Design a protein around this ligand. Structure first.
Ligand code: HEM
Length: 111
């Protein structure tokens, strides 16, 4: 629904370790755990922080090349996550001195 359009955000460090999920995304992934557990059997949304993103990517070096090269960010794509569908945006996070920290992901639900 349009009432359900919100800001879904997930952050990782340069080594691909998930650092933070915002509440809207945590709520969505909890709601969608039926679909997510079919695509990713042991999936628990509250358990994602500290995990490496490589676990969830079928060709992990592809996403690694995207988040390792902040000069080529921002990156946008449409992705299928099990039976879910998202419009994905990946942007570079930087510290106060301008250094790249890792990727931030925004997902727009188009399931
Ligand atoms: C901040 C953490 C994450 C980053 C930086 C990240 C990075 C990316 C990027 C850039 C894409 C687009 C690839 C493309 O369209 O060519 C992508 C797609 C995808 N991501 Fe993630 N992702 C993250 C978290 C997750 C999580 C938690 C899951 C599983 C729940 C996941 C599973 C997928 C899947 C299934 C796709 C589409 C199919 C694939 O390329 O493997 N990602 N990810």
């Amino acid at each position: 629904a349009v009432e359900g359009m919100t800001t879904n955000l997930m952050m990782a460090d340069k080594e691909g370790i998930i650092q933070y999920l915002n509440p809207a995304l945590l709520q969505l992934l909890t709601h969608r755990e039926p679909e997510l557990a079919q695509a990713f059997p042991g999936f628990k949304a509250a358990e994602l922080v500290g995990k490496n993103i490589d676990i969830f990517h079928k060709n992990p070096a592809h996403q690694r090349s995207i988040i390792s090269n902040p000069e080529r960010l921002p990156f946008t794509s449409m992705i299928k996550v099990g039976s879910l569908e998202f419009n994905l945006t990946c942007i570079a996070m930087r510290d106060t001195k301008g250094e790249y920290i890792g990727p931030a992901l925004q997902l727009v639900d188009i399931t």
